[PDB]
Amino acid sequence: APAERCAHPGADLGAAVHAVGQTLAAGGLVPPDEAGTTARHLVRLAVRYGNSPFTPLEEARHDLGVDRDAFRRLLALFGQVPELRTAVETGPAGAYWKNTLLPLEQRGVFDAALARKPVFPYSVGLYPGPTCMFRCHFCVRVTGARYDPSALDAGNAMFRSVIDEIPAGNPSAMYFSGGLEPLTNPGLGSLAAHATDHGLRPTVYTNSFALTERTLERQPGLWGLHAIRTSLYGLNDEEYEQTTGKKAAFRRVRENLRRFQQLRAERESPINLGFAYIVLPGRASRLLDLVDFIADLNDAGQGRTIDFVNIREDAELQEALNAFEERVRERTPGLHIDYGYALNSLRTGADAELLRIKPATMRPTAHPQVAVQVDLLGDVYLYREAGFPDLDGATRYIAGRVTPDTSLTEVVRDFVERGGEVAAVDGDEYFMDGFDQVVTARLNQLERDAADGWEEARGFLR
Ligand code: SF4
């Protein structure tokens, strides 16, 4: 429907305006003589927030050129045109709205962060790996940097205690990922077993280099995971060496996943399999080779197919994305595609840059109500990419340490209740992952809207 699609490049706004005007007039919401003018303002707001989801309400108001009073009425009328919310939620910016902003809002998570309440974190990352075998360009691993082997026993006992804390109501709250490589922890399978015994359904994010048949034999609890998402660093040995520094690494990862596919089919295991792939500038044609890679694994699986792929950026991208989507429908129809925030709007030809938070726009309280990460030492990191040993300036972002005497619940509560705040210095912004930046940008928007006297309407859509 025209009003449902109006945020995409080249959309028919005349048809969107007519459709919205008809809804307003048929609902008695505005006099028919003025329905067209108001419908144009509402379509403009849908186009705006369907492309730029963090826009302060006052900036959008100024761009419409209307009264604070007229804007209040517009926001109320917007809520009575369901097609326009669809236009925002499925627009170029739709990955922001449907995958992150609106699920967290509806779970009260941004409300808790905004009010700075000492709630248990919504998403808890456990970083259980003491090392990694790869040597990616800018990671601490291109030093000796690693956790001491002696930390494993106490660390794994600490992780179990954190698993015992996870409140009910969200089986996916906890995941295993890292700074460093989780499969490097000999006890990861028993942590996964512990988690599944406590009703959790966690995913592991891994390079899968050590996901061999021998590892599964020593760590049978990995089979009980909800999912294994392999970070794909290339599609042949050459591209893998460029990225990881390791030779023959693609064939090892592919060899591991081929065998894993056959074992998953033999055990009839409910575990899911996904991949994360980064499209490099000018190399978007490689997405077709990613389909070939996945189809091959599907052949190893005797019917059991790869479940999902996550594709993000950082020759014409929109064409390569289109060709990629066609190739998936052709060769791997059951494959679910999840697009990162930028590539999701590039799908329809919309100009899109990823967020680039700088120290001036970092929130000194961070957002532990939304996410924290815990490493082998029990240190609770406030941003996903600060949790690396020997990483310069990163320990400033430790909210506290989980020990036998202090729980994760207590670390977070104590840090929130004392008004804990970390002043941002240059470079701290690289401790944030894409999720941290979306959460920061959303909370900056919510704080701005509330400060401008739009408390209930804060964030435009919720
Ligand atoms: S970025 Fe990840 S895979 Fe690469 S060296 Fe660091 S921990 Fe290992």
Residue numbers in the entry: 10 to 323, 338 to 485
Paper lines:
DesII is a radical S‐adenosyl‐l‐methione (SAM) enzyme that catalyzes the radical‐mediated deamination of TDP‐4‐amino‐4,6‐dideoxy‐d‐glucose (1) to TDP‐3‐keto‐4,6‐dideoxy‐d‐glucose (2) during the biosynthesis of TDP‐desosamine (3). Like other radical SAM enzymes, the catalytic cycle of DesII is characterized by initial single electron transfer from a reduced, active site [Fe4S4]+ cluster to SAM. Each monomeric unit comprises three domains: an N‐terminal domain of six α‐helices, a central radical SAM (RS) domain, and a C‐terminal domain consisting of a β‐hairpin and two α‐helices. The RS domain (residues S132–L369) coordinates the single [Fe4S4] cluster via residues C141, C145, and C148, which make up the CX3CX2C motif.
Addition of TDP‐4‐amino‐4,6‐dideoxy‐d‐glucose or TDP‐d‐quinovose during crystallization screening did not result in the acquisition of a ternary complex structure in either case, and an effort was made to remove the C‐terminal His6‐tag found to occupy the binding pockets of chains a and c. Therefore, a second DesII expression construct was generated by inserting the desII gene into the pSJ5 expression vector containing a TrxA fusion partner, His8‐tag, and TEV site. This produced soluble, high‐purity protein without the N‐terminal His‐tag after purification by Ni‐NTA extraction and TEV enzyme digestion. The corresponding crystals were grown in 0.1 m MES monohydrate containing 20% PEG 6000 and 1.0 m LiCl at pH 6.0. The asymmetric unit consisted of two DesII monomers, neither bound SAM; instead, the fourth iron of the [Fe4S4] cluster in one monomer coordinated with a water molecule and the other with methionine. Comparison with the binary DesII·SAM structure (rmsd 0.533 Å) revealed that the flexible loop between residues D323 and E337, which interact with the adenine moiety of SAM in the binary structure, was also missing from the density map. Addition of 1 or 4 to the crystallization media did not result in substrate‐bound complexes.
